[PDB]
Amino acid sequence: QNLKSTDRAVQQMLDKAKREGIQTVWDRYEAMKPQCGFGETGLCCRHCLQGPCRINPFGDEPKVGICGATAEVIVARGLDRSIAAGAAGHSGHAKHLAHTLKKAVQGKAASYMIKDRTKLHSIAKRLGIPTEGQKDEDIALEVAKAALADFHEKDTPVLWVTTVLPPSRVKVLSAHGLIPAGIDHEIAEIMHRTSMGCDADAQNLLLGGLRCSLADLAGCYMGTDLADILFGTPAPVVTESNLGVLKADAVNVAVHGHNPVLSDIIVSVSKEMENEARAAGATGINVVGICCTGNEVLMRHGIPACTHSVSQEMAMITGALDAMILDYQCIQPSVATIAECTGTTVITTMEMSKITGATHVNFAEEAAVENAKQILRLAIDTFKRRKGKPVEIPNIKTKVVAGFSTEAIINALSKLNANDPLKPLIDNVVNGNIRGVCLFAGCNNVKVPQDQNFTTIARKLLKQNVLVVATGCGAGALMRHGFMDPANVDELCGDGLKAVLTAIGEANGLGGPLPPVLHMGSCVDNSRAVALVAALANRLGVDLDRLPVVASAAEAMHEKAVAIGTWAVTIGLPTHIGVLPPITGSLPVTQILTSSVKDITGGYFIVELDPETAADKLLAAINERRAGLGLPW
Amino acid sequence: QNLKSTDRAVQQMLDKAKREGIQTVWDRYEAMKPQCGFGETGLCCRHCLQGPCRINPFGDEPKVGICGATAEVIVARGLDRSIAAGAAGHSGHAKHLAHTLKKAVQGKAASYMIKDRTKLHSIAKRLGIPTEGQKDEDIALEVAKAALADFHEKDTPVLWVTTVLPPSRVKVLSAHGLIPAGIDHEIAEIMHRTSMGCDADAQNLLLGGLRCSLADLAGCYMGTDLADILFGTPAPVVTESNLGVLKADAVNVAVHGHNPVLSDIIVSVSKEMENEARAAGATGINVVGICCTGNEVLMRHGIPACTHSVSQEMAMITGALDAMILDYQCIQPSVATIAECTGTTVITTMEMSKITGATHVNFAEEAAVENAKQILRLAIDTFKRRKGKPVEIPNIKTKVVAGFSTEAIINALSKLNANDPLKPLIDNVVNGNIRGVCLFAGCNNVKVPQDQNFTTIARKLLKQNVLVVATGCGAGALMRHGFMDPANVDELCGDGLKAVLTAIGEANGLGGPLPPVLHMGSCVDNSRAVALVAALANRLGVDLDRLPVVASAAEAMHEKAVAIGTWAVTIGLPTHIGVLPPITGSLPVTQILTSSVKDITGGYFIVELDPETAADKLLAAINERRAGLGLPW
Ligand code: SF4
Ligand code: SF4
Ligand code: FES
Ligand code: FES
Structure with missing residues (x-):
């Protein structure tokens, strides 16, 4: 059962399900093998009733779709639809919360309320909504209206993109036409342009995908903002x-x-x-x-x-x-x-x-x-x-x-420097006690022994003094294997990281370090990591693609995880994915996503199924960023 | 080459392409055979990176997707995404025209203008926009704003649904929760609910699809309305x-x-x-x-x-x-x-x-x-x-x-009855000179010898006195085979239909009949057929599912054609499709779409690949409607 999951509690229940005859996700996976290689490589298209069309990765015909769609087009269109579907989930979640907030302050749902007034006012300020002399219920009504407004075209672009990244990053993205016009607008335009007989240029298609991934980021950040107003900032x-x-x-x-x-x-x-x-x-x-x-x-x-x-x-x-x-x-x-x-x-x-x-x-x-x-x-x-x-x-x-919300991380650091709270973190990046930052994000996937990539990669990075933060089922994997227990800092962390975790912990009354990995919350709360990294960029006066920060969707599954990985690339991060997305059937698309996108956004995908190799590639990316800043590594 | 196309000009060019070595859509189709039966039947899912998942139509495992998704769920989710993609295309087209109209009357694009003032004012009136004492440019600015507003949630539902169908039909749809809240809102909600680990009930999924198809109808009708304002009503x-x-x-x-x-x-x-x-x-x-x-x-x-x-x-x-x-x-x-x-x-x-x-x-x-x-x-x-x-x-x-816009058809009929222009048409339905109405819509499809289904079905219906209207590449098929030439009325039409076409033609100065088939325009102009049928319903005081009106997407291809077929069902029509949509891998989904949806909307799909059989099934549906009205048949 250890081939199925590295979690011993899961192993025990797999034994129970076996002797009770209850079929599991692993059993349904085994029954699916061998899986279709056309789908696995991205060389399948069902976007019209002339299909299905497939393309042999190698050999003889079929070489092209029936309408003329090349491998490059088929792979890019499938990828784009997955991004739009992910964006639709994160932003449907956020939209629901926006309606809940409106209801609450309109007197229509008394079980809900403004619990974090501080968060409400800072969001209003970020958006340019006036607070001085206004009722909280009216500020919140304006924030909810602004949230709903970002789903469609209007005279401004999506504010939960343009007000949450550094102006220099917004400028780079605007220059490539990548700022979304509206969250549901971009989702629909993806579905349109990927439908039969429409967009048929890989670069154009993928630029659309990057823009739609920022619509996903907006939905994530909106969801975190609204949940914190309603339910409290962690x-x-x-x-x-x-x-x-x-x-x-x-x-x-x-x-x-x-x-x-x-x-x-x-x-x-x-x-x-x-x-x-x-x-x-x-x-x-x-x-x-x-x-x-x-x-x-x-x-x-x-x-x-x-x-x-x-x-x-x-x-x-x-x-x-x-x-x-x-x-x-x-x-x-x-x-x-x-x-x-x-x-x-x-x-x-x-x-x-x-x-x-x-x-x-x-x-x-x-x-x-x-x-x-x-x-x-x-x-x-x-x-x-x-x-x-x-x-x-x-x-x-x-x-x-x-x-460890971003507000909480800043507060923790502020105990080492009250009026410049990010400086203690940057100080320790500069002197090598912190080599860089890695965000683990995303799902488990039945193709990967459960948690094996998250824990293998995290162990190597922690020993190399990387500050590790985590969300979603990446945080789930790490918490279930002890990576959120401060008692494991000695075993897991390099000496420099240990020194920093301990210094921050002891300054926060703990008599012990922070935990080895910082849990920054749910999948929409990947937006919190963006807030932290954007604040670091602003404090340093550089863009995110010069920071020693990387991301790893080490066991990705859901379309939402493809969307997150794509906006991590779009905002400037080296971004590892530890499962194959359906792109290997097109070398041109693979080359865009792993290499030439660097020239557009400064980020890029690192596709690597072997977790020891992925860790080395992520360390190399962190160290290249350190070198670009003139730092030792 | 007659196995590829029934068009003799196409046959001639196929010979030229063959001897010149130019590969065609038919050659790329041949190279794709045999096509994947999992995709053809709908029993394939790539909505997450655990896939691809397939299900054997019959036999042994795999019987279920890896996450637990049943055949019913997989088929309904794939179908729903095709509807959303179609809606995204028709409504992206309409959205573009809405922005063009706004630009025009804001003085920003002088190549464009209000060409049909009459159409502008009637649309404004339909929407409840005031015209009395208003500049045309301001009426149009309000119409364009209303068009753009229908893409998102607001205090009203989608007006290009609720103001274009009879109140009784809106009531039936509202009771089942099928009225769209916003065009891009529904597209995104489809992509969300069909993503991994979300909606997993076939009936619930398909109800979502019906609602999204009405978002497609809204986009069609908006596109026709705005194009007529800008470019003139045909x-x-x-x-x-x-x-x-x-x-x-x-x-x-x-x-x-x-x-x-x-x-x-x-x-x-x-x-x-x-x-x-x-x-x-x-x-x-x-x-x-x-x-x-x-x-x-x-x-x-x-x-x-x-x-x-x-x-x-x-x-x-x-x-x-x-x-x-x-x-x-x-x-x-x-x-x-x-x-x-x-x-x-x-x-x-x-x-x-x-x-x-x-x-x-x-x-x-x-x-x-x-x-x-x-x-x-x-x-x-x-x-x-x-x-x-x-x-x-x-x-x-x-x-x-x-x-033959709907305005043009009404004007033509008005020459037989100036103050009750629909009555001459209804008179001839009642006395059997017109058996019913059939709308041919949609694409050609490389799987079907080009035009063979459109012309075979149309010939049988015309001989049985059916009034045939057509749009899109259905109109294209019929025009290229002579069905829009009045010289062919004697050959093609039953005596009762001929009598009516002649009576209307001679009253419009032609000295000859109307043509055998009425060309009602482009694919968005399927909305014109809806306007005509809705006006007939209102004149009779019945809902569309009591009228002897049917639709045939006889050689469908595009996701847009699946969306149109689905809203034809949703508004109450028996709707033939002459290519297999990817649904036969689930008998429960097939039964909903061809049978139990009758109990929801009164319409239903008729899936029939043999065109002589399809014609008989369409005549049976027309005649059942005549019987329900107490009419001879
Ligand atoms: S869109 Fe082109 S490649 Fe895709 S199924 Fe249709 S014909 Fe095949
Ligand atoms: S959503 Fe379920 S059925 Fe579809 S690919 Fe993923 S695991 Fe397979
Ligand atoms: S041929 Fe298997 S995914 Fe389409
Ligand atoms: S297995 Fe062929 S369409 Fe997926």
């Missing part, structure tokens, strides 16, 4: 991760998906139904996180993380998961059939994300508390149905220190 | 079609694509450069149409149609096509390589639709006349380069009567 928190955070004698409720508009309420309501849970025989209601929605409530409330991404079914296999409360994105639809076997109540809540066989509860912000109670009462009923049934919760968990 | 016109409209001694310039914002200007400018063309040795500039842009200028100006859709390369093979001026959509990218062999100058004009190897001219409304002159001067230079070269223009053309 600060350091201590909790735990992995299946051992389940409790046989509690009602175990997983929140799973992405948008916490529901699950932040589930958290608060669950606390108030403790006595109702005790009346039914439980100790209380044990809310645990899966995937991004779990990251959101981990960051804000210290809710323990149960599992992530590829191993999500395994939480159900314990037999102790009484309910799984779903919104959207990254939910394996198998959970609805597995629930028949495990007893778990799977509940969908969003109109546009239903799963056949799951119970649907039509969540409305107007009714959030009542919806939560309905849902948790199904969870309580399910807990009662498993009175006397044995469960198998692996007794495996790690300690997790998390909550 | 009225009856006489011209010709097929390759014989090329002239060896003229500069032959094809306008090809969809959006006529450029090609309407090309037409007017070409007339003024006649003397410059004569100075270079030509008789003049001969502008001819390909695909929809050609339909647009055929309808408004009587520009002859050269060819359509699958046979577009054949215009170049004559050797006489001096330039091909492209905007976007349905342009085989092969034309850019074929041009090397044929001498043709292929010119792209739109930023988001480029073709490697073609010359690009960056058209701007602000500069339309100057751009046109630059483009036509390249065409003149190319004409000069072929001094003394033999050309092979097949001497094959048909006479075409076209221009």
Whole structure:
């Protein structure tokens, strides 16, 4: 089972699923082998009913699509649609939060409110919305209106791009026509230009993809901004991760998906139904996180993380998961059939994300508390149905220190330099105690033994004094293997990084270091890493493509992860991807994405499936940036 | 060659391409055989990097996608994305025209203007925009603003849906949540909900697809409305079609694509450069149409149609096509390589639709006349380069009567009843002289011998007294085979239909009938057929799903054609498709789309590849509707 997952709790549940005959994502993967090589290389097109068209990577015909589309065009069009789909998910999430904020301050949903006034006012200021002499509810109404306005064309470009990057970067992007005009506008223009008989030039297509990836960035940053207003900006928190955070004698409720508009309420309501849970025989209601929605409530409330991404079914296999409360994105639809076997109540809540066989509860912000109670009462009923049934919760968990929003990181650094908080970080980059920064992002992928790339790469970088930050299921992988536990700094970190983590920790009252890896939150919270890197750029007076900062989507899966990787390139970062995107069937497209895009944005993809080799390539990229700054390396 | 195309001019050019070694769309099709059956049946998914996933239609594993996605989900998600892509093309076209209109009346593009004031005021009235006491430029600015507003959420739904269908139909659709909130909003929500780990219920997914198809309808109707304001509403016109409209001694310039914002200007400018063309040795500039842009200028100006859709390369093979001026959509990218062999100058004009190897001219409304002159001067230079070269223009053309906008049809009928113009049509439906109405729409498809389904089905319906209207490359197929020539009424039409065509024609001064088939314009001008059918419904006080009206996308290809077929179903029509959409791998999805959707919208798909059988099925659907109205059949 260690070929399937490096997580020992997952291995234990894989054994249980095997002897119980429950098919898993790994079993469905094995049944899919050998996979189609045309699709794997990108040399397949179904964009019209003359298809499917495929192209042999090598050999004889077919060499060209039926309409004349070359390999270059087919690969670029498929890639562009994946970016647009990712942008559609992150920005649909943000759009939902924008409507929630508007409702809240219009008096239409009293379960929601402005919790972070400071964040609200700074966002308003960033956008040029006046605050002086204004009601908070009116400032927020203006912010929500501005958020919704960025989805369409207007007299300004997308402000959640142009106001969040340095002016020099906006200038570079504008010169190449890469600033989005509107988030949904760009998504639609991608779908148009990639449809049959439209755009048929690889460079033109890919420039469109870069622009659409910035629409994805805008959606991420908008989602983080709005969630922080509504639910609070994260600060350091201590909790735990992995299946051992389940409790046989509690009602175990997983929140799973992405948008916490529901699950932040589930958290608060669950606390108030403790006595109702005790009346039914439980100790209380044990809310645990899966995937991004779990990251959101981990960051804000210290809710323990149960599992992530590829191993999500395994939480159900314990037999102790009484309910799984779903919104959207990254939910394996198998959970609805597995629930028949495990007893778990799977509940969908969003109109546009239903799963056949799951119970649907039509969540409305107007009714959030009542919806939560309905849902948790199904969870309580399910807990009662498993009175006397044995469960198998692996007794495996790690300690997790998390909550490192960019505001929190700045505050932590400010204890070393109150009026120039980024300077202590830059000082230690300059003197080599910090070699660079690496952001781990994205999913697990059934093709890669779960977590193996994240942990292999992170271990090598940490020993080379790289400051590692993480989001999404990259953070999930790292937390479940101990990388967010400060007790592991001695083992994992080079001496210079240890010195810095310790200096910052001891200045924040901890008597111990910061953890080896800084958890910056959910996938939309990749925007937080952008805020940090942009602030560093501004403090240094350089653009992001001169900073020793890289990104790694080491086990990427979702179209959202392709979008994030693409905007990391577009904003200037060397960006590793540890799974093959469907591009190897076109050398010209591969060359654009890994090489000549450097001349456009200064970033570039590093495609590398071997994680030891990927780490060396990422270190080389960091060190090239150090050399460009005149720094030792 | 008659297995490839039923058009004799196309057959002749296929022989020429064969002996010259020029590969065609039919050759690239042959090289693609056998095509992938997983894609053909819809049982393939590449929506994440764990894929590709396929499902065997029958037999053993793989039976399910790696994430758990069933055949039903995979097929519905692929279909939904095709609808969104079609919606993105028709509404990108409309959006462009909306910006052009705004520019025109803001004084920013004097080559454009309000040409149809009557149309402008009636659209304003339909939308609830005040006209009394307003400048035309201000009415138009408001109409353009309303058009752009329908692309995003706002306090009203999409007005180019809710103001163009009968209130009873809007009520049925609203009750099922099918009215779009915004055109690009729905496109993005499709891409979101079909991404990995989101919507996974076939019925829910397909309801989303129906709503997105109405976003496509809105884009079509907006495009027709705005083009009529800017360029004039079509009225009856006489011209010709097929390759014989090329002239060896003229500069032959094809306008090809969809959006006529450029090609309407090309037409007017070409007339003024006649003397410059004569100075270079030509008789003049001969502008001819390909695909929809050609339909647009055929309808408004009587520009002859050269060819359509699958046979577009054949215009170049004559050797006489001096330039091909492209905007976007349905342009085989092969034309850019074929041009090397044929001498043709292929010119792209739109930023988001480029073709490697073609010359690009960056058209701007602000500069339309100057751009046109630059483009036509390249065409003149190319004409000069072929001094003394033999050309092979097949001497094959048909006479075409076209221009039957809905306003024109109403005006024609009004000569039989001035104050109740629809009543003569309804009278003849009631007494059986008109059995029903059939709209032929959509593309040619290399899988079907070109035009064979359109002409086979049309011949059977016309003999059964069906009033046949046509758009797009369906109109192209019918015009090239003589179905728009009134001289063929005796041969083609049943006696009752002949009587009606003759009565209307003789009342309009013609001394002859209307043509056998009424050309209602381009693909967005399928919206004109909706206006006609909606007006009939309103006059009868019934919904569209009680009218004896059907649609046939008899040789469909483009994602746009899937979108149109889907909104024809959604607004209440029995809708034939003569090529397999990728749905046969899921019987549940097939059953929804061909049967249980009747219970939602009253329309339904008729999937039938045999055209004689399709005609019988369409007649049965028409006759069932007649029976529901209590009419003989
Ligand atoms: S768009 Fe071109 S390459 Fe794609 S399926 Fe259609 S014919 Fe084939
Ligand atoms: S979304 Fe599911 S079915 Fe599609 S490729 Fe990914 S794992 Fe396979
Ligand atoms: S041929 Fe397998 S992905 Fe299309
Ligand atoms: S397996 Fe051929 S279309 Fe994917």
